[PDB]
């Protein structure tokens, strides 16, 4: 039996864990919390840490641990399960990427068609969308977007987008508040994450939902995909069944269990989600490097500059 530090969504983590027990008989305990907190906890603990595996919703947390030398190198077959152009790759072969979640624009089909949408997310911060586009300034995904824009187009383009959103866009407390705002007819469109809509639609019945998703693609900053991954800790006393859990995660069975309940893009190519998600390669997501500590501070100072926080 193993212990998994889970920075991933609980019903997701839980569904993949139960599937693992049914196939191997290996029980799984889950210590849930967010990646960066759990990563630090593992740092403090060290050699006598209870963690066998680290299931993170983000790549940065895995990097810090990898840099501290705390991660166990995985067998080649585990890593190749999700290998592909654009998919994050571990330098010390000590962690593997598993899934992705994209940024999108949700619009009101009662008033808009794909014809009326922009070809780049940078184009929404203009007078043509004054009071017609919504965003969530306190969202951790919104900041990730800021960080990618700076890496892809420079600092100047990032502050121009933000100040332009402040002057014409409309802020919303959460991503849920923003989605239900477009669904209510209070605002034309809004910048959010893909799974929010996919979940709402599955719950309500798509024939009753008036909102739809738009993907810019073409390596635009707005086509940004964020990845999930997993690793085994060198300090583990159950390493072989810890390696099995990571291989199950990267493999077909694991991928199918996760995509039966979670609307994230499967990195394993032999998997068909139960949600209407095209193959990840088709989103034409831009290639961006992992988010560092200084990079978050920079985007944080830029939101202050723009006056959104």
PDB file of C-alpha atoms in Angstrom:
ATOM      1  CA  UNK A   1       0.000   0.000   0.000  1.00  0.00           C
ATOM      2  CA  UNK A   2       1.232   3.517  -0.834  1.00  0.00           C
ATOM      3  CA  UNK A   3       0.870   7.178   0.147  1.00  0.00           C
ATOM      4  CA  UNK A   4       0.334   9.792  -2.569  1.00  0.00           C
ATOM      5  CA  UNK A   5       0.762  13.518  -2.038  1.00  0.00           C
ATOM      6  CA  UNK A   6      -2.030  14.902  -4.204  1.00  0.00           C
ATOM      7  CA  UNK A   7      -1.911  18.408  -5.648  1.00  0.00           C
ATOM      8  CA  UNK A   8      -4.398  17.226  -8.227  1.00  0.00           C
ATOM      9  CA  UNK A   9      -8.223  17.563  -8.079  1.00  0.00           C
ATOM     10  CA  UNK A  10      -9.621  15.134  -5.422  1.00  0.00           C
ATOM     11  CA  UNK A  11     -12.386  13.457  -7.464  1.00  0.00           C
ATOM     12  CA  UNK A  12      -9.811  13.067 -10.201  1.00  0.00           C
ATOM     13  CA  UNK A  13      -7.146  11.684  -7.890  1.00  0.00           C
ATOM     14  CA  UNK A  14      -9.766   9.484  -6.239  1.00  0.00           C
ATOM     15  CA  UNK A  15     -11.078   7.998  -9.516  1.00  0.00           C
ATOM     16  CA  UNK A  16      -7.577   7.117 -10.741  1.00  0.00           C
ATOM     17  CA  UNK A  17      -6.684   5.626  -7.330  1.00  0.00           C
ATOM     18  CA  UNK A  18      -9.747   3.373  -7.097  1.00  0.00           C
ATOM     19  CA  UNK A  19      -9.043   2.131 -10.621  1.00  0.00           C
ATOM     20  CA  UNK A  20      -5.472   1.283  -9.524  1.00  0.00           C
ATOM     21  CA  UNK A  21      -6.725  -0.771  -6.554  1.00  0.00           C
ATOM     22  CA  UNK A  22      -9.167  -2.766  -8.689  1.00  0.00           C
ATOM     23  CA  UNK A  23      -6.368  -3.784 -11.084  1.00  0.00           C
ATOM     24  CA  UNK A  24      -3.553  -4.498  -8.585  1.00  0.00           C
ATOM     25  CA  UNK A  25      -5.074  -4.834  -5.107  1.00  0.00           C
ATOM     26  CA  UNK A  26      -2.705  -2.089  -3.871  1.00  0.00           C
ATOM     27  CA  UNK A  27      -4.501   0.330  -1.522  1.00  0.00           C
ATOM     28  CA  UNK A  28      -3.856   4.069  -1.876  1.00  0.00           C
ATOM     29  CA  UNK A  29      -3.942   6.792   0.771  1.00  0.00           C
ATOM     30  CA  UNK A  30      -4.302  10.390  -0.412  1.00  0.00           C
ATOM     31  CA  UNK A  31      -2.919  13.474   1.310  1.00  0.00           C
ATOM     32  CA  UNK A  32      -4.565  16.259  -0.687  1.00  0.00           C
ATOM     33  CA  UNK A  33      -3.476  19.885  -0.985  1.00  0.00           C
ATOM     34  CA  UNK A  34      -1.914  22.144  -3.625  1.00  0.00           C
ATOM     35  CA  UNK A  35       1.326  21.243  -5.357  1.00  0.00           C
ATOM     36  CA  UNK A  36       3.562  23.989  -4.029  1.00  0.00           C
ATOM     37  CA  UNK A  37       2.556  23.408  -0.392  1.00  0.00           C
ATOM     38  CA  UNK A  38       2.996  19.641  -0.630  1.00  0.00           C
ATOM     39  CA  UNK A  39       6.378  20.120  -2.371  1.00  0.00           C
ATOM     40  CA  UNK A  40       7.662  22.196   0.524  1.00  0.00           C
ATOM     41  CA  UNK A  41       6.321  19.659   3.002  1.00  0.00           C
ATOM     42  CA  UNK A  42       8.356  16.963   1.239  1.00  0.00           C
ATOM     43  CA  UNK A  43      11.411  19.231   1.424  1.00  0.00           C
ATOM     44  CA  UNK A  44      11.082  19.678   5.176  1.00  0.00           C
ATOM     45  CA  UNK A  45      10.486  15.968   5.849  1.00  0.00           C
ATOM     46  CA  UNK A  46      13.300  14.596   3.688  1.00  0.00           C
ATOM     47  CA  UNK A  47      14.609  11.058   4.273  1.00  0.00           C
ATOM     48  CA  UNK A  48      11.779  10.225   6.703  1.00  0.00           C
ATOM     49  CA  UNK A  49       8.953  11.639   4.567  1.00  0.00           C
ATOM     50  CA  UNK A  50       5.747   9.522   4.288  1.00  0.00           C
ATOM     51  CA  UNK A  51       5.348  10.318   0.586  1.00  0.00           C
ATOM     52  CA  UNK A  52       5.793   7.479  -1.884  1.00  0.00           C
ATOM     53  CA  UNK A  53       4.490   9.362  -4.936  1.00  0.00           C
ATOM     54  CA  UNK A  54       3.812  13.029  -5.682  1.00  0.00           C
ATOM     55  CA  UNK A  55       0.790  13.632  -7.934  1.00  0.00           C
ATOM     56  CA  UNK A  56       1.026  17.299  -8.925  1.00  0.00           C
ATOM     57  CA  UNK A  57      -1.337  19.514 -10.861  1.00  0.00           C
ATOM     58  CA  UNK A  58       1.726  21.533 -11.951  1.00  0.00           C
ATOM     59  CA  UNK A  59       5.223  21.117 -13.393  1.00  0.00           C
ATOM     60  CA  UNK A  60       6.983  23.801 -11.289  1.00  0.00           C
ATOM     61  CA  UNK A  61       6.508  21.842  -8.011  1.00  0.00           C
ATOM     62  CA  UNK A  62       8.058  18.779  -9.628  1.00  0.00           C
ATOM     63  CA  UNK A  63      11.019  20.907 -10.839  1.00  0.00           C
ATOM     64  CA  UNK A  64      11.911  22.289  -7.392  1.00  0.00           C
ATOM     65  CA  UNK A  65      12.001  18.770  -5.972  1.00  0.00           C
ATOM     66  CA  UNK A  66      13.984  17.507  -8.958  1.00  0.00           C
ATOM     67  CA  UNK A  67      16.499  20.318  -8.413  1.00  0.00           C
ATOM     68  CA  UNK A  68      16.848  19.292  -4.756  1.00  0.00           C
ATOM     69  CA  UNK A  69      17.694  15.806  -6.083  1.00  0.00           C
ATOM     70  CA  UNK A  70      14.740  14.302  -4.160  1.00  0.00           C
ATOM     71  CA  UNK A  71      13.131  12.498  -7.133  1.00  0.00           C
ATOM     72  CA  UNK A  72      13.619   8.910  -8.329  1.00  0.00           C
ATOM     73  CA  UNK A  73      14.538   8.300 -11.989  1.00  0.00           C
ATOM     74  CA  UNK A  74      11.702   6.521 -13.858  1.00  0.00           C
ATOM     75  CA  UNK A  75      12.015   3.619 -16.340  1.00  0.00           C
ATOM     76  CA  UNK A  76      12.072   4.652 -20.016  1.00  0.00           C
ATOM     77  CA  UNK A  77       8.765   2.902 -20.813  1.00  0.00           C
ATOM     78  CA  UNK A  78       6.865   5.034 -18.277  1.00  0.00           C
ATOM     79  CA  UNK A  79       8.088   8.319 -19.770  1.00  0.00           C
ATOM     80  CA  UNK A  80       7.488   7.323 -23.391  1.00  0.00           C
ATOM     81  CA  UNK A  81       3.786   6.710 -22.729  1.00  0.00           C
ATOM     82  CA  UNK A  82       3.007  10.432 -22.965  1.00  0.00           C
ATOM     83  CA  UNK A  83       5.950  11.578 -25.154  1.00  0.00           C
ATOM     84  CA  UNK A  84       5.236  14.050 -27.955  1.00  0.00           C
ATOM     85  CA  UNK A  85       6.053  17.434 -29.502  1.00  0.00           C
ATOM     86  CA  UNK A  86       5.249  20.181 -26.999  1.00  0.00           C
ATOM     87  CA  UNK A  87       4.921  17.835 -24.020  1.00  0.00           C
ATOM     88  CA  UNK A  88       7.191  18.852 -21.083  1.00  0.00           C
ATOM     89  CA  UNK A  89      10.197  16.558 -20.630  1.00  0.00           C
ATOM     90  CA  UNK A  90      12.147  15.957 -17.392  1.00  0.00           C
ATOM     91  CA  UNK A  91      15.894  16.543 -17.753  1.00  0.00           C
ATOM     92  CA  UNK A  92      16.903  14.002 -15.093  1.00  0.00           C
ATOM     93  CA  UNK A  93      14.147  11.639 -16.302  1.00  0.00           C
ATOM     94  CA  UNK A  94      12.706  11.838 -12.785  1.00  0.00           C
ATOM     95  CA  UNK A  95       9.088  12.901 -13.479  1.00  0.00           C
ATOM     96  CA  UNK A  96       6.599  12.529 -16.348  1.00  0.00           C
ATOM     97  CA  UNK A  97       3.841  14.778 -17.723  1.00  0.00           C
ATOM     98  CA  UNK A  98       0.325  13.310 -17.722  1.00  0.00           C
ATOM     99  CA  UNK A  99      -2.367  15.781 -18.757  1.00  0.00           C
ATOM    100  CA  UNK A 100      -3.140  19.296 -19.892  1.00  0.00           C
ATOM    101  CA  UNK A 101      -5.829  21.959 -19.495  1.00  0.00           C
ATOM    102  CA  UNK A 102      -6.228  24.841 -21.967  1.00  0.00           C
ATOM    103  CA  UNK A 103      -7.252  28.505 -21.874  1.00  0.00           C
ATOM    104  CA  UNK A 104     -10.330  29.352 -23.987  1.00  0.00           C
ATOM    105  CA  UNK A 105     -12.940  31.995 -24.726  1.00  0.00           C
ATOM    106  CA  UNK A 106     -16.545  31.146 -23.783  1.00  0.00           C
ATOM    107  CA  UNK A 107     -19.120  33.111 -25.813  1.00  0.00           C
ATOM    108  CA  UNK A 108     -22.892  33.700 -26.056  1.00  0.00           C
ATOM    109  CA  UNK A 109     -24.267  31.755 -29.025  1.00  0.00           C
ATOM    110  CA  UNK A 110     -27.533  33.703 -28.753  1.00  0.00           C
ATOM    111  CA  UNK A 111     -25.579  36.699 -30.104  1.00  0.00           C
ATOM    112  CA  UNK A 112     -22.258  35.485 -31.527  1.00  0.00           C
ATOM    113  CA  UNK A 113     -20.822  33.127 -34.116  1.00  0.00           C
ATOM    114  CA  UNK A 114     -17.213  31.984 -34.603  1.00  0.00           C
ATOM    115  CA  UNK A 115     -17.068  34.674 -37.342  1.00  0.00           C
ATOM    116  CA  UNK A 116     -17.168  37.454 -34.755  1.00  0.00           C
ATOM    117  CA  UNK A 117     -14.278  36.179 -32.611  1.00  0.00           C
ATOM    118  CA  UNK A 118     -10.657  37.372 -32.534  1.00  0.00           C
ATOM    119  CA  UNK A 119      -7.630  35.578 -34.026  1.00  0.00           C
ATOM    120  CA  UNK A 120      -5.533  36.328 -30.937  1.00  0.00           C
ATOM    121  CA  UNK A 121      -6.351  36.797 -27.253  1.00  0.00           C
ATOM    122  CA  UNK A 122      -4.261  39.981 -27.318  1.00  0.00           C
ATOM    123  CA  UNK A 123      -6.963  41.578 -29.492  1.00  0.00           C
ATOM    124  CA  UNK A 124      -9.680  41.583 -26.830  1.00  0.00           C
ATOM    125  CA  UNK A 125      -8.070  44.522 -24.985  1.00  0.00           C
ATOM    126  CA  UNK A 126      -9.438  47.065 -27.474  1.00  0.00           C
ATOM    127  CA  UNK A 127     -12.416  49.507 -27.759  1.00  0.00           C
ATOM    128  CA  UNK A 128     -14.317  47.029 -29.964  1.00  0.00           C
ATOM    129  CA  UNK A 129     -14.861  44.919 -26.855  1.00  0.00           C
ATOM    130  CA  UNK A 130     -15.548  47.687 -24.330  1.00  0.00           C
ATOM    131  CA  UNK A 131     -17.846  46.036 -21.762  1.00  0.00           C
ATOM    132  CA  UNK A 132     -18.032  42.865 -23.901  1.00  0.00           C
ATOM    133  CA  UNK A 133     -15.217  40.668 -22.565  1.00  0.00           C
ATOM    134  CA  UNK A 134     -14.845  39.350 -19.029  1.00  0.00           C
ATOM    135  CA  UNK A 135     -11.733  38.218 -17.137  1.00  0.00           C
ATOM    136  CA  UNK A 136     -10.771  37.017 -13.639  1.00  0.00           C
ATOM    137  CA  UNK A 137      -7.806  39.112 -12.317  1.00  0.00           C
ATOM    138  CA  UNK A 138      -7.380  37.088  -9.082  1.00  0.00           C
ATOM    139  CA  UNK A 139      -7.178  33.783 -10.941  1.00  0.00           C
ATOM    140  CA  UNK A 140      -3.966  31.777 -10.856  1.00  0.00           C
ATOM    141  CA  UNK A 141      -4.605  30.826 -14.491  1.00  0.00           C
ATOM    142  CA  UNK A 142      -4.891  34.489 -15.476  1.00  0.00           C
ATOM    143  CA  UNK A 143      -1.370  35.046 -14.081  1.00  0.00           C
ATOM    144  CA  UNK A 144      -0.051  31.999 -15.936  1.00  0.00           C
ATOM    145  CA  UNK A 145      -1.419  33.658 -19.078  1.00  0.00           C
ATOM    146  CA  UNK A 146       0.486  36.859 -18.178  1.00  0.00           C
ATOM    147  CA  UNK A 147       3.730  34.911 -17.716  1.00  0.00           C
ATOM    148  CA  UNK A 148       3.390  33.225 -21.142  1.00  0.00           C
ATOM    149  CA  UNK A 149       2.635  36.490 -22.950  1.00  0.00           C
ATOM    150  CA  UNK A 150       5.877  38.007 -21.611  1.00  0.00           C
ATOM    151  CA  UNK A 151       7.921  34.992 -22.682  1.00  0.00           C
ATOM    152  CA  UNK A 152       6.301  34.872 -26.144  1.00  0.00           C
ATOM    153  CA  UNK A 153       5.929  38.602 -26.996  1.00  0.00           C
ATOM    154  CA  UNK A 154       8.003  40.471 -24.404  1.00  0.00           C
ATOM    155  CA  UNK A 155       7.170  42.603 -21.374  1.00  0.00           C
ATOM    156  CA  UNK A 156       5.668  45.528 -23.318  1.00  0.00           C
ATOM    157  CA  UNK A 157       2.897  43.470 -24.942  1.00  0.00           C
ATOM    158  CA  UNK A 158       1.941  42.033 -21.525  1.00  0.00           C
ATOM    159  CA  UNK A 159       1.337  45.420 -19.859  1.00  0.00           C
ATOM    160  CA  UNK A 160      -0.553  46.752 -22.888  1.00  0.00           C
ATOM    161  CA  UNK A 161      -2.940  43.776 -22.797  1.00  0.00           C
ATOM    162  CA  UNK A 162      -3.561  44.156 -19.051  1.00  0.00           C
ATOM    163  CA  UNK A 163      -4.158  47.913 -19.047  1.00  0.00           C
ATOM    164  CA  UNK A 164      -6.391  47.430 -22.071  1.00  0.00           C
ATOM    165  CA  UNK A 165      -8.437  44.816 -20.194  1.00  0.00           C
ATOM    166  CA  UNK A 166      -8.776  47.144 -17.196  1.00  0.00           C
ATOM    167  CA  UNK A 167     -10.174  49.936 -19.384  1.00  0.00           C
ATOM    168  CA  UNK A 168     -12.614  47.871 -21.469  1.00  0.00           C
ATOM    169  CA  UNK A 169     -13.081  44.461 -19.868  1.00  0.00           C
ATOM    170  CA  UNK A 170     -15.088  43.526 -16.798  1.00  0.00           C
ATOM    171  CA  UNK A 171     -13.565  41.707 -13.798  1.00  0.00           C
ATOM    172  CA  UNK A 172     -15.258  38.777 -12.065  1.00  0.00           C
ATOM    173  CA  UNK A 173     -14.600  37.272  -8.654  1.00  0.00           C
ATOM    174  CA  UNK A 174     -14.168  33.677  -9.872  1.00  0.00           C
ATOM    175  CA  UNK A 175     -14.223  31.709 -13.136  1.00  0.00           C
ATOM    176  CA  UNK A 176     -17.636  30.265 -12.214  1.00  0.00           C
ATOM    177  CA  UNK A 177     -19.110  33.732 -11.678  1.00  0.00           C
ATOM    178  CA  UNK A 178     -17.767  34.762 -15.101  1.00  0.00           C
ATOM    179  CA  UNK A 179     -19.150  31.695 -16.911  1.00  0.00           C
ATOM    180  CA  UNK A 180     -22.624  32.050 -15.441  1.00  0.00           C
ATOM    181  CA  UNK A 181     -22.394  35.731 -16.422  1.00  0.00           C
ATOM    182  CA  UNK A 182     -22.025  34.818 -20.119  1.00  0.00           C
ATOM    183  CA  UNK A 183     -24.686  32.121 -19.746  1.00  0.00           C
ATOM    184  CA  UNK A 184     -27.047  34.686 -18.181  1.00  0.00           C
ATOM    185  CA  UNK A 185     -26.545  37.165 -21.022  1.00  0.00           C
ATOM    186  CA  UNK A 186     -24.866  39.863 -18.923  1.00  0.00           C
ATOM    187  CA  UNK A 187     -21.699  39.857 -21.052  1.00  0.00           C
ATOM    188  CA  UNK A 188     -20.776  38.725 -24.584  1.00  0.00           C
ATOM    189  CA  UNK A 189     -17.727  36.597 -23.751  1.00  0.00           C
ATOM    190  CA  UNK A 190     -15.046  35.870 -21.147  1.00  0.00           C
ATOM    191  CA  UNK A 191     -11.542  34.399 -20.715  1.00  0.00           C
ATOM    192  CA  UNK A 192     -11.604  31.113 -18.694  1.00  0.00           C
ATOM    193  CA  UNK A 193     -10.289  27.506 -18.523  1.00  0.00           C
ATOM    194  CA  UNK A 194     -11.835  24.727 -20.639  1.00  0.00           C
ATOM    195  CA  UNK A 195     -13.006  22.224 -18.009  1.00  0.00           C
ATOM    196  CA  UNK A 196     -15.369  24.728 -16.312  1.00  0.00           C
ATOM    197  CA  UNK A 197     -17.654  24.739 -19.352  1.00  0.00           C
ATOM    198  CA  UNK A 198     -17.298  21.011 -20.048  1.00  0.00           C
ATOM    199  CA  UNK A 199     -18.414  20.217 -16.487  1.00  0.00           C
ATOM    200  CA  UNK A 200     -21.337  22.673 -16.445  1.00  0.00           C
ATOM    201  CA  UNK A 201     -22.569  21.326 -19.771  1.00  0.00           C
ATOM    202  CA  UNK A 202     -22.347  17.671 -18.662  1.00  0.00           C
ATOM    203  CA  UNK A 203     -24.361  18.549 -15.553  1.00  0.00           C
ATOM    204  CA  UNK A 204     -27.072  20.622 -17.294  1.00  0.00           C
ATOM    205  CA  UNK A 205     -27.399  18.851 -20.662  1.00  0.00           C
ATOM    206  CA  UNK A 206     -25.807  20.673 -23.634  1.00  0.00           C
ATOM    207  CA  UNK A 207     -29.174  21.313 -25.303  1.00  0.00           C
ATOM    208  CA  UNK A 208     -30.003  23.622 -22.374  1.00  0.00           C
ATOM    209  CA  UNK A 209     -26.673  25.475 -22.422  1.00  0.00           C
ATOM    210  CA  UNK A 210     -26.324  28.636 -24.561  1.00  0.00           C
ATOM    211  CA  UNK A 211     -22.568  29.132 -24.235  1.00  0.00           C
ATOM    212  CA  UNK A 212     -19.855  27.592 -26.430  1.00  0.00           C
ATOM    213  CA  UNK A 213     -16.030  27.462 -26.525  1.00  0.00           C
ATOM    214  CA  UNK A 214     -13.511  29.056 -28.894  1.00  0.00           C
ATOM    215  CA  UNK A 215      -9.880  28.013 -29.276  1.00  0.00           C
ATOM    216  CA  UNK A 216      -7.492  30.442 -31.031  1.00  0.00           C
ATOM    217  CA  UNK A 217      -4.802  27.815 -31.805  1.00  0.00           C
ATOM    218  CA  UNK A 218      -1.935  28.899 -34.133  1.00  0.00           C
ATOM    219  CA  UNK A 219       0.577  29.017 -31.217  1.00  0.00           C
ATOM    220  CA  UNK A 220      -1.095  32.228 -30.020  1.00  0.00           C
ATOM    221  CA  UNK A 221      -0.555  33.044 -26.321  1.00  0.00           C
ATOM    222  CA  UNK A 222      -4.289  32.439 -25.879  1.00  0.00           C
ATOM    223  CA  UNK A 223      -3.861  28.776 -26.887  1.00  0.00           C
ATOM    224  CA  UNK A 224      -1.817  28.153 -23.707  1.00  0.00           C
ATOM    225  CA  UNK A 225      -1.936  24.619 -22.223  1.00  0.00           C
ATOM    226  CA  UNK A 226      -0.777  23.815 -18.658  1.00  0.00           C
ATOM    227  CA  UNK A 227       0.476  20.339 -17.744  1.00  0.00           C
ATOM    228  CA  UNK A 228       0.082  17.831 -14.898  1.00  0.00           C
ATOM    229  CA  UNK A 229       2.668  15.193 -13.957  1.00  0.00           C
ATOM    230  CA  UNK A 230       3.845  12.678 -11.339  1.00  0.00           C
ATOM    231  CA  UNK A 231       7.010  11.349  -9.661  1.00  0.00           C
ATOM    232  CA  UNK A 232       8.408   8.871  -7.142  1.00  0.00           C
ATOM    233  CA  UNK A 233      10.462  10.085  -4.141  1.00  0.00           C
ATOM    234  CA  UNK A 234      13.950   8.626  -3.555  1.00  0.00           C
ATOM    235  CA  UNK A 235      13.030   8.396   0.139  1.00  0.00           C
ATOM    236  CA  UNK A 236      10.226   5.900  -0.541  1.00  0.00           C
ATOM    237  CA  UNK A 237      10.134   2.474   1.108  1.00  0.00           C
ATOM    238  CA  UNK A 238       7.573   1.186  -1.397  1.00  0.00           C
ATOM    239  CA  UNK A 239       9.387   2.207  -4.591  1.00  0.00           C
ATOM    240  CA  UNK A 240       8.369  -0.695  -6.881  1.00  0.00           C
ATOM    241  CA  UNK A 241       4.604  -0.262  -6.356  1.00  0.00           C
ATOM    242  CA  UNK A 242       5.257   3.496  -6.430  1.00  0.00           C
ATOM    243  CA  UNK A 243       6.686   3.057  -9.926  1.00  0.00           C
ATOM    244  CA  UNK A 244       3.618   0.964 -10.857  1.00  0.00           C
ATOM    245  CA  UNK A 245       1.278   3.761  -9.814  1.00  0.00           C
ATOM    246  CA  UNK A 246       3.167   6.297 -11.991  1.00  0.00           C
ATOM    247  CA  UNK A 247       3.200   3.852 -14.917  1.00  0.00           C
ATOM    248  CA  UNK A 248      -0.555   3.281 -14.457  1.00  0.00           C
ATOM    249  CA  UNK A 249      -1.048   7.058 -14.534  1.00  0.00           C
ATOM    250  CA  UNK A 250       0.887   7.414 -17.781  1.00  0.00           C
ATOM    251  CA  UNK A 251      -0.648   4.325 -19.377  1.00  0.00           C
ATOM    252  CA  UNK A 252      -3.940   3.633 -21.173  1.00  0.00           C
ATOM    253  CA  UNK A 253      -5.901   2.343 -18.179  1.00  0.00           C
ATOM    254  CA  UNK A 254      -4.831   5.224 -15.985  1.00  0.00           C
ATOM    255  CA  UNK A 255      -5.522   7.829 -18.666  1.00  0.00           C
ATOM    256  CA  UNK A 256      -9.003   6.450 -19.357  1.00  0.00           C
ATOM    257  CA  UNK A 257      -9.976   6.544 -15.667  1.00  0.00           C
ATOM    258  CA  UNK A 258      -8.955  10.206 -15.313  1.00  0.00           C
ATOM    259  CA  UNK A 259     -10.656  11.288 -18.543  1.00  0.00           C
ATOM    260  CA  UNK A 260     -13.887   9.531 -17.491  1.00  0.00           C
ATOM    261  CA  UNK A 261     -14.411  12.203 -14.850  1.00  0.00           C
ATOM    262  CA  UNK A 262     -11.969  15.052 -15.554  1.00  0.00           C
ATOM    263  CA  UNK A 263     -12.083  17.329 -18.602  1.00  0.00           C
ATOM    264  CA  UNK A 264      -8.300  17.576 -19.126  1.00  0.00           C
ATOM    265  CA  UNK A 265      -6.495  16.611 -22.340  1.00  0.00           C
ATOM    266  CA  UNK A 266      -5.049  13.058 -22.343  1.00  0.00           C
ATOM    267  CA  UNK A 267      -1.332  12.996 -23.165  1.00  0.00           C
ATOM    268  CA  UNK A 268      -1.423   9.265 -23.970  1.00  0.00           C
ATOM    269  CA  UNK A 269      -2.335   8.976 -27.700  1.00  0.00           C
ATOM    270  CA  UNK A 270      -4.471   5.778 -27.508  1.00  0.00           C
ATOM    271  CA  UNK A 271      -7.082   7.414 -25.276  1.00  0.00           C
ATOM    272  CA  UNK A 272     -10.528   8.749 -26.131  1.00  0.00           C
ATOM    273  CA  UNK A 273     -11.875  11.191 -23.560  1.00  0.00           C
ATOM    274  CA  UNK A 274     -15.549  10.934 -22.554  1.00  0.00           C
ATOM    275  CA  UNK A 275     -15.724  14.698 -23.116  1.00  0.00           C
ATOM    276  CA  UNK A 276     -15.636  16.330 -26.557  1.00  0.00           C
ATOM    277  CA  UNK A 277     -11.920  17.149 -26.550  1.00  0.00           C
ATOM    278  CA  UNK A 278      -9.961  16.999 -29.811  1.00  0.00           C
ATOM    279  CA  UNK A 279      -6.365  15.540 -29.698  1.00  0.00           C
ATOM    280  CA  UNK A 280      -4.092  17.884 -27.713  1.00  0.00           C
ATOM    281  CA  UNK A 281      -1.763  18.406 -30.709  1.00  0.00           C
ATOM    282  CA  UNK A 282      -4.713  20.055 -32.506  1.00  0.00           C
ATOM    283  CA  UNK A 283      -4.989  23.007 -30.100  1.00  0.00           C
ATOM    284  CA  UNK A 284      -1.639  24.081 -31.559  1.00  0.00           C
ATOM    285  CA  UNK A 285      -0.515  25.211 -28.092  1.00  0.00           C
ATOM    286  CA  UNK A 286       2.581  27.485 -27.966  1.00  0.00           C
ATOM    287  CA  UNK A 287       5.796  25.998 -26.571  1.00  0.00           C
ATOM    288  CA  UNK A 288       6.544  27.767 -23.260  1.00  0.00           C
ATOM    289  CA  UNK A 289       9.056  27.028 -20.457  1.00  0.00           C
ATOM    290  CA  UNK A 290       7.990  26.254 -16.885  1.00  0.00           C
ATOM    291  CA  UNK A 291       7.047  29.073 -14.531  1.00  0.00           C
ATOM    292  CA  UNK A 292       9.763  30.172 -12.077  1.00  0.00           C
ATOM    293  CA  UNK A 293       9.468  32.072  -8.810  1.00  0.00           C
ATOM    294  CA  UNK A 294      10.803  35.334 -10.280  1.00  0.00           C
ATOM    295  CA  UNK A 295       8.410  35.031 -13.219  1.00  0.00           C
ATOM    296  CA  UNK A 296       5.381  35.019 -10.881  1.00  0.00           C
ATOM    297  CA  UNK A 297       6.691  38.089  -9.004  1.00  0.00           C
ATOM    298  CA  UNK A 298       7.055  39.892 -12.327  1.00  0.00           C
ATOM    299  CA  UNK A 299       3.478  39.180 -13.466  1.00  0.00           C
ATOM    300  CA  UNK A 300       2.250  40.049  -9.978  1.00  0.00           C
ATOM    301  CA  UNK A 301       3.871  43.475 -10.174  1.00  0.00           C
ATOM    302  CA  UNK A 302       2.315  43.924 -13.625  1.00  0.00           C
ATOM    303  CA  UNK A 303      -1.233  43.365 -12.319  1.00  0.00           C
ATOM    304  CA  UNK A 304      -0.497  45.962  -9.663  1.00  0.00           C
ATOM    305  CA  UNK A 305       0.766  48.266 -12.432  1.00  0.00           C
ATOM    306  CA  UNK A 306      -2.398  47.660 -14.466  1.00  0.00           C
ATOM    307  CA  UNK A 307      -4.520  48.288 -11.363  1.00  0.00           C
ATOM    308  CA  UNK A 308      -6.287  44.925 -11.165  1.00  0.00           C
ATOM    309  CA  UNK A 309      -4.800  43.966  -7.820  1.00  0.00           C
TER     310      UNK A 309
END
